[PDB]
Input
Amino acid sequence: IIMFEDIFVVDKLDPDGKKFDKVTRVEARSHNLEMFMHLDVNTEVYPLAVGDKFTLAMAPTLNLDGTPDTLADKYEYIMHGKLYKISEKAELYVSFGGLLMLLQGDPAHISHFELDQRLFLLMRKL
Amino acid sequence: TNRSTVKISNVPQTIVADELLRFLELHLGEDTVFALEIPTTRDNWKPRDFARVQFTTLEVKSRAQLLSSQSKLLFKTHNLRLSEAYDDIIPRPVDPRKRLDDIVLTVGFPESDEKRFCALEKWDGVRCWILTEKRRVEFWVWESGDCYKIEVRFEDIIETLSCCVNGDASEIDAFLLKLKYGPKVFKRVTDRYRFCKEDFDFMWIRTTDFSGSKSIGTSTCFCLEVHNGSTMLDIFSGLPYYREDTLSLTYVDGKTFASAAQIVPLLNAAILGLEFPYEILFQLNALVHAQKISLFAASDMELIKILRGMSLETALVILKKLHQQSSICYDPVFFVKTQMASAYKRLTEQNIMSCQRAYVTPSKIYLLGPELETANYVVKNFAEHVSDFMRVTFVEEDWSKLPANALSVNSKEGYFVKPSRTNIYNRVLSILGEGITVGPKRFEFLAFSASQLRGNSVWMFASNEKVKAEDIREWMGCFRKIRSISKCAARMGQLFSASRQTLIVRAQDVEQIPDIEVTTDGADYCFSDGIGKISLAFAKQVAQKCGLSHVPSAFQIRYGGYKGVIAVDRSSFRKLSLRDSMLKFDSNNRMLNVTRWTESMPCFLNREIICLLSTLGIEDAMFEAMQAVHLSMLGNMLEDRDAALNVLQKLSGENSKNLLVKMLLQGYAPSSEPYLSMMLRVHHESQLSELKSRCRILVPKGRILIGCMDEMGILEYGQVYVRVTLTKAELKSRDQSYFRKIDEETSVVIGKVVVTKNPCLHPGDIRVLDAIYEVHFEEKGYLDCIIFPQKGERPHPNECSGGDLDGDQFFVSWDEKIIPSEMDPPMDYAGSRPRLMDHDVTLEEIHKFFVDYMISDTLGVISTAHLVHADRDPEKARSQKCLELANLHSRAVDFAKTGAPAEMPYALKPREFPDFLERFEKPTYISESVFGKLYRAVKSSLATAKAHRDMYGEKLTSLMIYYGAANEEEILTGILKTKEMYLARDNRRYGDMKDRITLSVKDLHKEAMGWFEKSCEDEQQKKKLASAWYYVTYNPNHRDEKLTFLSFPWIV
Output
């Protein structure tokens, strides 16, 4: 059910602030696959410091064996969004209700993603 | 970890330096921050987003880095990120042990032969800092309030010694620093965002000697009086060439040796008070300046008393032998006790003269001595005052070029920035004005040549009762007609090139042929810039004294102020003729002399040619294949004798006779004949080094020849005539489509030939010309000279970077694989407006111009910047940046003619260099252009008889130790594998030194030939003696304990 799943390590933060009361964009580089990622995260509700390691997963649906549109107990930062731009080292542009995500990796790693589809974002900081 | 300054990534814009300092001291240890600087875009009210902080101890820096890595630094909801910095805020060593405060500093020299030292001036309470990373030692001396900085590098010192001042051998209370060069001298000159923990809000500018008695400029050694230190030896052990021995010294009252004159290191003339010769005194001064004998060791009464009355030749021999001593001599008296006409002929034969060369530094002056060099025209009619001529060059302490920051440092005073002249500027002005006094002489400024202007060199002549400097100046010509400062200097210094003396022609038979001018598109284009006309009889007369068999069709000549190349013709009226656009200045003499007649050398491809030819459509495969075949034929030259002759006949000299060339065609195996095999190996190594340093492609289908014009008017715009000699490759296979076998030795070309020069930075210089064959043109008999049409829209030299027909070389090549489809218009050749004064030259503005030539001299950096920008940005030589760089280069070239500074912008600096450069200290980036591919390919490829023999060997080893050579190959070939700190940065000085040593070895060979001719004077007996010499030198058992030289018998 999970299409893409890899361990990511953050590198730097765009605001580099603790109590800025603003959405923070993170830059995390994948291990092994070595895929650069941009993601907007809220630090106040989901703290994330530099050097931390977190896992990331993407699934079309949260149900088991079909039923598109029970993985909630495993992860803790589930999001929902759609992929609108796929043109690039291919990269993906997924917006989770205005929160842009840029997953830049290799053309072979990202091959089973269609245009204008709904996908989730499963995250856990170990 | 090398430095201690840490750059903070992001800081709030509303904070001040005090708040950040308090935060750092709260998180870290108390008072652990030395310097904190926040850069500001504006003057004092707009700080930047980052800041740089300097820590006292590396442990504090490591702790701060650890805290930053854990994101434990939070100052006003900002996470401080720490990164390494480029340079320290203050050049202060991290180790507190190296910091020495309140110590005694004194200067002096080894005055006595024994273990004695002399103190001239002593300073107390000085600050000494040792910078291991910067490889320099700083001395802070406070004198009359303002402090001065003395900078000594690790290369400045040659040996480190430790001594004592209390008188106890066990204790160490002193340190000796023997200096080879002079130390740099600085001076201190006269806040919200800069803490700095101290009063470091000033700047350092280079200055001259600040001592009243000028003790620094006359002292070659430094002594550091410091307290006894148990671990001080470990700190002092870091200095290069440290001796682990204990030495004792005593103080000698040497306050008498104090000179208040500008030239400090010269001896006093009033002490002698006799008829001492000038040559011996000059040699003694040269010895004192060299690190051989100290000042006091040669100022004693006994030495001058002994050297006063003796044989002059023996005195010169012993003086030069003492100069050739490998080490420093302490007792000259013992050495000299244990040791015990032609100039005119040399000038008339090979123009051999002994010219004194002097180096002027901000600290002292170095006299090299009477070095042999090629004679110029000014000394032909003034050969009696051979010793009065002296070459003076203004260099730095390391004998290098003076940096732009050392003269006229910029400072913002008022609304506009105005440069401020340093003390070195005034020192140079005073030296030029008052002059240099050496013994019973006073040299005066005569003039400086164009080549010397670019090397900061100038001629000086000692005034005499017979002829003075002004007498020579007025004898050369009248220069009051020129109202331009630069033009007058150029015309006065242009008559100093090497030339061969010929017959004298009066001013009765001179023609005034009118010229031709074409004005199109509102632009003045002149075809005849320096062209001339010559007859056959004049060529025959001028070729008789030069030993030239073939009569060239063109040769550069200058006489009576005129300058330009002249061409032959079959319809001449009389011997000589002249045009109108050739008179530079009026002169009282019309001596004829010729510099260059013809050189049919094979063409070479420089970096700019490939850079400008990489956009018309030429691929990288062609150049790669050419480099591959070049390296293949170079590597095969060692074990194959057939390729050696072909290479020697197609690389340097189309028709050259030499001992190596003759033996290459017919010789033994490469394994045998070590004298030839090692020469071939060193030649291959030199070729590889030259290829690594710069691109030089050997193309056999092209030559380098000058061009002229014929009074025919048949050729149109775009039609020229190409004719050159036939080389080995041409003779082997003369059947070609574009090659016409007009004669056995001369072959015509009908292919597409382009014209290129050495300096080229514009894509429009490539002008494809179609060569044609005409019977009428061949009837005139033109050889080794391309023919330019008289009529056309614009002259060919104008399209060639706005050149002139002044005997300049032109690159020609009858290649067929080039791409002529793309054509680009040339750039404008219009120069700056000339500057004319309202008054005659008072010999002061010329000095101002000469000194200001060093300032804003960006000629050598424009080419490098253009190459870097071309390699980085694709589609090179097409953007406006390349056009701007070409315009700036043209203006900088024109700076020697007209006083128009180049004005190099700051934003145009490359700040990055490719792999194929010698700037190891500067950052290196991997280049992916054609030059990068070529460099990678090169890198991959790379990865009675007894007495004469003894005399010759002694002379050769004396020359080797005088020029620093350690092996026969580097002195015979003139190429030195080892370089100094100043011989590697520039190539003009190295080329001049190579020419001088080549002249010296040629003189030695001529003397050997004379000795051989006088020894025997019998043909068969001479052959027998040569065979006997070869047999003796070939036998290994005949070698003595000393180094036997095998280069003596090889004379032909």
